[model samples]
Target: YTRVVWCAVGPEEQKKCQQWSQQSGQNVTCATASTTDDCIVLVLKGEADALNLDGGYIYTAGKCGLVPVLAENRKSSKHSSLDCVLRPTEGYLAVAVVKKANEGLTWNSLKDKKSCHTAVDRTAGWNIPMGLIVNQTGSCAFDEFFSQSCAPGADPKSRLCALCAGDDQGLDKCVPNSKEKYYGYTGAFRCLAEDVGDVAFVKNDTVWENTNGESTADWAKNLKREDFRLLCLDGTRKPVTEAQSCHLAVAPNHAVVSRSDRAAHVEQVLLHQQALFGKNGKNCPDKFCLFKSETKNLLFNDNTECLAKLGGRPTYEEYLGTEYVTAIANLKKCSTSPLLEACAFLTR
Candidate 1:
């Protein structure tokens, strides 16, 4: 009778989680939240069991006492003798994307530019780029660095949310959910695509996934891969396809997190659940694919091949790696997430 209650951010994810819950025969259930931070709070309050999280989020939840249960393994670039679960996680490439026509835009020229971000505390969208910017500029005033932005989770009345267009109904302009329009990876990219922002901070795959007919959505269907460019840290711009060499950082893969007390149960149940609904699971496609979704990415990223096991039980620091963790620590000095601060106060 052990049930894992998964946290779903936004209504679309809530709908997907409902389907997963029904398909799981109650082995898993859903706890809907407005944002990832809210979802973490749900888990902390014992209203939920687990949810997959970006490394930045993992840091926040980890500092609040949640433990990393599993890491997301995506398609490998090359063959490896090690099993998917045992193989070391290959981090994704974080890139700064801009339209090819955005002349004079480069890493060094990004100052005072309009920017789009996945969210306030995400990896590619915030921590890595902002962390590096703060380190290099020798200042922590990242908010003033960008002239305007659609960094969801920031104050709705601020310039950070200026470019955010709300849902189809034109509501929820800056909430950190799909309703905000310029929210997650796809949304942030769309913000750049629609010319609302001069640059977008997102993972490399977002470009390939939404361009060249890969995405059928009206806004993305006509986007050509060649129309965009990647900004490298060396103050140069390169083709989007050159992200392997042009990216800002190699970000850790998203992973599942749970309270230390329920980590074992959550991991065990997830292992069994994924076997039935995972990428290569027996029931996937025919029944339910835990990694696939109708509205782009849902509970888990569409690119997630499986919820792979960790090589060894790792603390949040071990999972995120030393350099990335230190970088996050540095960025936190510039601006601390209100939710993270609140969680720390509660835990303390």
Candidate 2:
């Protein structure tokens, strides 16, 4: 009589095996093995007839030789099925499915190896014959964004670089805050914290408490071209305007540029940043201002006072707190002008 062994990593996985055993009506024994090694031991002792890869086990029984069955979905493991049709008489039986004989070490080469020999070619082994059908009526630009459009002439290297460069600033300067705020040239900025007074600030005796304190005033300076143009243009070069000085500040986060489409790329980075750092905020809640200075050229600029306030480090997890409200307040006053736009454009 042969006994089947079912090994699982945890109670939950074991439960699943138990359910299967019960459904199959086989006298399968349940065993616990935290690691793959322990599961293989049971098979060597003839205690288990089949090992489950889920818990790393092997099965062994008298007169019933154990054969390893490789799962097709094993992404990290290498396997092949060439040994299934082997015979030692002729040193290996030659089996040809097509006329292309011996283009290299054909599949027939492994036909006469040992019983347990598994030959798997890492390269050029997964080929299937198929007829090609070319559609002469299709438009060229229609396939530009599809996966097939990436064949050649697309220049994926430079295209990817450009996309990445555009998103560098927004992603690099984005500091996670406890409140909800939008950081670009448009819209509201505030804290998304549950506490009401977490981002409180007073202006003209009228106290305001919100994720974005004063949207109208905060990004006012950042919207001007003179504020962030010097950083985007060639650094160490003189600015074209009096208001655009080289004195710019850096934010406290890791900035990255998208090397794809501009608007879509920025939005995707914002979503990722929000998922990683956003707290009560539904999306990325912190906003950053790009200064028209040379130091702010990259995403992780260190020369700006904003970066110092955030401990001179690129954005971190702790920024979800309300301690950096002052920095946020000052960022609203930065300039957002054609210089900043050009920088954003060139990065794309």
Candidate 3:
């Protein structure tokens, strides 16, 4: 009698959702939007039920009254006795990646360099790096720190979008979707891989997943793990393998969000749905694997092991943790968010 309508961030994700919809016997359905903000708006309007979000975007959705549902759990680096679902999640590592050939360039030398970001408002891509930059530089003009960048969701004519190459057809430049050539983690890493940017702001997993023959994509097929290095906060560089020490910030894992009233249903449906499509689920591989993706990440991250259940009914802020919440609050002071403004108006 009821269904969980998922809000997909783009056409690519919509297609993936449609497949999941069919596989789920229509128990789950899809609602499409151009950007993550648009998807959040859809969830707010009740046109959709839920979608997974990066922690930074989670802040916006939480501020607009959405509640955290299930979290995307991945394989842990350390040994854990608890089940993946019950084990409290370990945060992902946000890192700055630069080509090894770009010698003499450290975190201290990042000023005026060409940069590549996953997208605006994403934890690893924007908030963490920009937040640290704002705190260190003692200036709110974080945009000026990067001479040019492929930060999708910025004004198309702005320096932030200068390095953003559009889709295959050369449309939707700087748009915050897979259509933009340098849109998400894969895209931003590709931006650096192709030498379009001096450094890329992405996560440690992205480096390992796309390099050293890990990814079969044409752009990444030949990329070796040794060719890239991570910029440490101490103004030094280290191999990507050392991300445990040399990283920007440890960001909260991306998680599903829905309106508070719809959270219980969303959680129930996801728990069952993942049983059919999640990692090692009965229907996965031969049927449909919810965690696998053709274009890196779609509705959920490719590395997702399961949509793990959360305990104690944690609120968004509680789920995000105090340090991260405080960091985002600090970052928000440096810039205005039209999405946040719009959400405020709508809620009012």
Candidate 4:
């Protein structure tokens, strides 16, 4: 059966109705009511086929249907006079009305065309899913299960190995086996020297072997004979040199062991090792070592002296003078000889 409803008419007619409905919290109920008291409803016989009304309202009914009709009049003819019933679709009719209003307009027509083209392109692209395939040619043995294999050479060996491998050991395992075999004795030697000073035969033997017959006599000459006698008798000596002459001379000039110096030493050692055993070496198996050498040097050792000098002390201004002197001395030494230049370059 057809149902009829009355809606207000004005420039702000839709807004007014919306405000009223919101304030009243009323639902659109299917019923019949008739009055001129701001609202009205009418019910007619037969199902509605379709109905269109102003301000975005359209409805449809089954075939073989009839619709109710509404009529209105006002004393002020300029403001109100109507004889029609509006049937609105159940939802979102306002959007439809705005769309219809813009249909033939030039600006909106261009916008719609652009929107349609964009939608079509987006849909076309979405129709295909993108996938990533990793093709590795090497050993397949390292490939993980369920991971797609692109080529057979990817990983010939599937065996998974731990990050570290060695015999049961302590920090000694961290040292290369060859280096450990060569340098392990040096630690004991230094400890013995500290214990017995110049007369320490154990220290002399260790240093002698490690130095490849380099003289240990100069180092021993610096130690006091009296201290040696005391250590030999009591098995203990001054932990460090404290004699006034020693204090004035050797007193562990931390300047000699400055952070910058230590950092330079470390960098020099790294560069030396790289030069000896890296890709440039005849024994090197691949160019990988040479490729990585520059990267490692830049990342771990470059500017090390500057960083150490800056970070070693709490006050920057206090260290600046000393750093300037050290840097100048280093530059002078580097200028004097090619060997010094090589040393400085390696350290830098």
Candidate 5:
């Protein structure tokens, strides 16, 4: 049987994935993985083939000898088309946000503050900001800098998760799993909204999409656009709109990764998979909906235009482009921090 590593966060998604595999037929089926690192393990162990991954994980995956089979090309605002686009993934911006009232907290004063992160290992939340901080502080135990934090994927007993409010039962407080309420993009914003943290590290769109009744969820409906301010790279403060010029880093878009030996096979089957089950595919009305997730982007981005061909751009260093790879490499050097390694251990 041909086995593919199908990474999903929940049981409901697992069932849907089984259906996708069954439909694919010819004994090809998905082996469910609870996390990205788990799937990578399966691939290395020869128990699975490939898994879709976020950009933050690609560098690590590449180092493990995985290769890019395809990249998720997002639709461009500059142009619109009916055909699915496969252009290089245009990554988003990473920024730090604080309440507008925080007049004295510039980039320099960030030390010893209450912080909220989307999660450990996330592009905007961890890799970028901590990389820069490590360059200065020469430490990876970031808890030493942040007085307290709610970085969800950090070790449960670590100070990095000290501020997490956790789930309704007050259990799973620091666990990396989604059982924690403050786990992902919106969750990090909620941490800041509740005054649990002084600053939130996330992408720029996170604030715009959640504030002023934009998100409609209970936690975000009360947010006001003007209530927040952005920390600039030059020790200044600016409105959120200035993020393009005042960001910690710009992240590469997420992609679907596979083992190098199975790249061609994964690409062929994924293309076949999409033709039948994607948002605009043949079974559009009620079938293997490849994009929708109840609360987060589990396997792929919901807004993704389509999986664009890499045309033999084999490694993450090559597929991610030199400029983007340079930016990521600059931060990845900080990954040697024991704290980062610890977080990677639990999540893996």
Candidate 6:
């Protein structure tokens, strides 16, 4: 029996993959993998054929010999580049927020404060903010900036986890695990809501959705944009709706990756699968669809308008553009950046 081997990283992703499988008459099925790193290993070994890649993970995937083949483009994105057809998709911006009551707190003067982050190495929550700080102060004294923080992936003994109150009994503090109360985009915002952190780092839509009666969480259900504001670099603030002018960084769209040996095969299946389940395709209206998860990005991002070809797997710098790559490189100078010695150590 011929089958398309797919790997998923979370329960939501597992569910998305199974639905895709059923729609394809069991031709597409999920491969067993505990995490994205493991999924990369599975695909490289030919045990699995493909998985998706966030911009940050794309670097790691290339190191592991996986190649990007497809990307998720949003309809709102306008690409004016010469290679319009090949221009990568649009991505959300990483933004910082604080209560309207917080005064004299700018991107440049955020010392001795409390912070909430999605994770220790995430694009929105950690990398962009840290990159700016590193570029300016040339220090990773994250602990010094925020007297205490709740970065989920930090060392337990580090002050980063000092305020990380776990969800269950000693279950998720200072761990990359989602079980931690202050784990994902939503969780980080909640940390700020409950007064656990003075500042929250998250994606742009997070604030809009959470404060505009779109979210169901206790912290977000009654939240209002008027009650909070975005902290800009000019030591000024704006509403959450003005993200384009006031954000830490704009990330690159996520892409689908496969081992070079399986690139054609995986792309073929994606072409088949998308024809039926794509955003505007046959099965999307009332049936299976990619990127429709209500809570978070499952196997794919929810805001995905459509999947487009990327020609081929370019080098890390080629795929992510010079500006994005420059910021990440700046942060890597500090040991606190997510591209730890492990990434370099493992590659060599």
Best by TM-score: 3
Ordered by lDDT, highest first, the candidates read 3, 1, 6, 5, 2, 4
lDDT of 1 by residue, 261-338 (tens): 999999999999999999889999999999987436788888888888886778888899999989998889777676
**Model 4 C-alpha lDDT per residue in residues 55-127, reported as the tens digit of each score:** 1010101001111121111122232333211211111000000111122322112211211000000111000
Candidate 5, residues 1-348, lDDT tens digits: the string is: 455555554344466567767766733466755555666667766777777776667766766677888777665655455456444456688899989876798888999998888777777877778878877777756657889899976776888899987778887785544556676677787788888998889888778877887666777778897999889879898998898888888787677777777887878778877777676878754655676554355566555657878756658777666776665677665446333353455334
Q: Which ten residues in a row have the lowest lDDT in candidate 2?
A: 122-131
* Model 1 Cα shift for residue 83 (angstroms): 3.1
lDDT of 3 by residue, 1-348 (tens): 488999998898989999999999989999999999989989999999999999989999988889899998999867666787777788899999999987989999999999999999889999999999999999999888999999998778899999999999889889999888888999999999999999999999998999877788999889998889999999899998899999898889999999988999999999899889899889999899999996469989999888887877887788999898889989988778877776666345
Best by lDDT: 3
lDDT of each: 0.89, 0.22, 0.90, 0.20, 0.72, 0.74
RMSD of model 6 against the true structure? 3.5
Clashing pairs in 5: none
TM-score of candidate 2 against the unseen true structure: 0.19
Q: Estimate, for each residue in 49-121, the C-alpha lDDT of model 2 and write its tens digit.
A: 3332210011111111223221111011123322211211111011111111112222223222111000000
Off by over 4 Å in 6: 32-34, 77-88, 165-170, 336-348
TM-score to native of every candidate shown:
0.96, 0.19, 0.97, 0.15, 0.84, 0.84
| Candidate 1: residue 92 Cα off by (Å) | 0.7
Alpha-carbon RMSD to native, per candidate = 1.6, 31.7, 1.5, 45.1, 4.1, 3.5
Q: Which wins on lDDT, candidate 1 or candidate 4?
A: 1
User: Model 5 misses residue 216 by how many Å?
Assistant: 3.6
lDDT of 6: 0.74
* 266 Cα displacement, candidate 6 (Å): 1.9
Off by over 4 Å in 1: 80-82, 343-348
**Candidate 3: lDDT over CA atoms?**
0.90
For model 4, state the Cα shift of residue 117 in Å. 81
